Amino acid sequence: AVIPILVIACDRSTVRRCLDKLLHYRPSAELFPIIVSQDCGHEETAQVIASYGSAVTHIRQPDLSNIAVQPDHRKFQGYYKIARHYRWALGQIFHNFNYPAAVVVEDDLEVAPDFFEYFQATYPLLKADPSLWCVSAWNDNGKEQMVDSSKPELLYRTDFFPGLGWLLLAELWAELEPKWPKAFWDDWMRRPEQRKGRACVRPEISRTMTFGRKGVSHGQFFDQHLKFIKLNQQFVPFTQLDLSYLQQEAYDRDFLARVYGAPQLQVEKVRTNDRKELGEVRVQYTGRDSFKAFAKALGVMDDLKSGVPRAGYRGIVTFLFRGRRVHLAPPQTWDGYDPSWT
Ligand SMILES: O=c1ccn([C@@H]2O[C@H](COP(=O)(O)OP(=O)(O)O)[C@@H](O)[C@H]2O)c(=O)[nH]1
Numbered sequence: 001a002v003i004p005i006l007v008i009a010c011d012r013s014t015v016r017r018c019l020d021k022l023l024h025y026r027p028s029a030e031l032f033p034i035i036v037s038q039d040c041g042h043e044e045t046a047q048v049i050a051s052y053g054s055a056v057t058h059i060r061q062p063d064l065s066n067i068a069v070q071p072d073h074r075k076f077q078g079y080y081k082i083a084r085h086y087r088w089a090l091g092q093i094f095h096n097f098n099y100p101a102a103v104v105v106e107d108d109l110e111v112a113p114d115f116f117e118y119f120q121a122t123y124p125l126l127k128a129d130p131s132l133w134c135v136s137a138w139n140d141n142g143k144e145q146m147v148d149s150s151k152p153e154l155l156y157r158t159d160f161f162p163g164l165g166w167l168l169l170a171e172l173w174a175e176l177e178p179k180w181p182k183a184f185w186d187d188w189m190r191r192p193e194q195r196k197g198r199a200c201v202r203p204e205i206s207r208t209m210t211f212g213r214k215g216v217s218h219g220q221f222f223d224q225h226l227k228f229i230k231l232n233q234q235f236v237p238f239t240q241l242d243l244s245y246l247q248q249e250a251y252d253r254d255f256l257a258r259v260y261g262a263p264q265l266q267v268e269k270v271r272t273n274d275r276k277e278l279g280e281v282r283v284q285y286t287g288r289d290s291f292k293a294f295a296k297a298l299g300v301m302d303d304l305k306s307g308v309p310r311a312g313y314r315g316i317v318t319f320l321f322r323g324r325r326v327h328l329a330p331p332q333t334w335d336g337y338d339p340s341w342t
């Protein structure tokens with residue numbers, strides 16, 4: 001299947017780093033055409049993209065005008081521009097070029113060696129399972145000490161849309177475009193009105209890493225969290241593996257049985273590495289305060305978007321802690337996310 005890589009660029013010449021890695025690992029130019037959509041009009045960045053010649057297709061967002069923002073958004077013009085560019089670029093991919101799907105890659109992302117293999121293998125899953133709405137290369141809790149380096153092939157389902165290197169079908173763009181927001185597109189997709197209970201596939205070890213310390217957003221989130229996500233460097237032949245375990249029917253039975261069948265341990269014992277014979281445990285939280293307290297105690301991202309925790313699935317956040325597999329989970333009576341958990 002032909003799956004274009006849509007690279008979103010603007011005014012950072014470091015799009016070079018992004019393109020160099022994509023082109024180095026690309027297994028087929030025919031199967032993975034690279035389309036670089038550039039906003040802003042920055043000359044140096046345009047020259048960098050143009051220098052790749054026919055290895056990429058360079059297109060330019062046509063409307064470089066300033067955008068009238070709402071009264072609460074004077075400091076956020078950049079986010080309005082990002083949203084406008086996404087709408088135009090995705091429109092080019094799905095309306096002009098008429099591709100069936102696309103992997104969206106921001107210009108400050110470096111991909112892993114098996115980035116293409118991963119999407120080639122998971123595309124069929126996304127096509128077949130309507131309960132999935134994306135495949136993402138990003139593990140929100142993918143810091144080196146929180147992932148199992150011996151399981152680079154392990155994948156999961158997540159209710160938290162990760163973005164940062166993600167595959168979507170033309171069918172999803174059909175649903176999103178008519179109501180595309182003025183700004184903050186990713187948090188908008190995280191709302192239940194958009195997500196509609198759908199999940200994304202995400203890996204144990206991230207297939208992308210960001211180097212965009214300087215960008216539209218102030219660098220604090222990058223400095224405290226994003227910079228620490230470990231990029232996978234061990235090539236996994238995903239197309240040769242049986243990924244049927246990711247189908248909702250199998251996953252919701254097996255993964256959930258696994259989580260709730262695991263012994264429960266108090267957060268303090270997990271933290272101080274007590275009871276090491278229990279290689280897989282569950283740390284149960286019962287409310288917003290305990291979730292944030294326990295997440296923080298174990299070094300897990302503790303913010304919530306529309307009530308969904310980072311990398312969470314049915315409220316469960318799975319990660320490694322000092323070599324132990326941990327599932328920070330709600331009681332099994334869990335029955336939906338509460339957006340008021342902020
Ligand atoms: O006016 C702009 C500013 C940025 N971007 C793009 O939108 C993405 C997000 O930008 P950035 O990485 O700077 O955002 P941050 O991660 O800092 O929130 C990148 O692909 C940029 O090239 C854009 O299309 N138009």
Ligand SMILES: [Mn+2]
Binds near residue numbers: 212
């Ligand atoms: Mn960025």
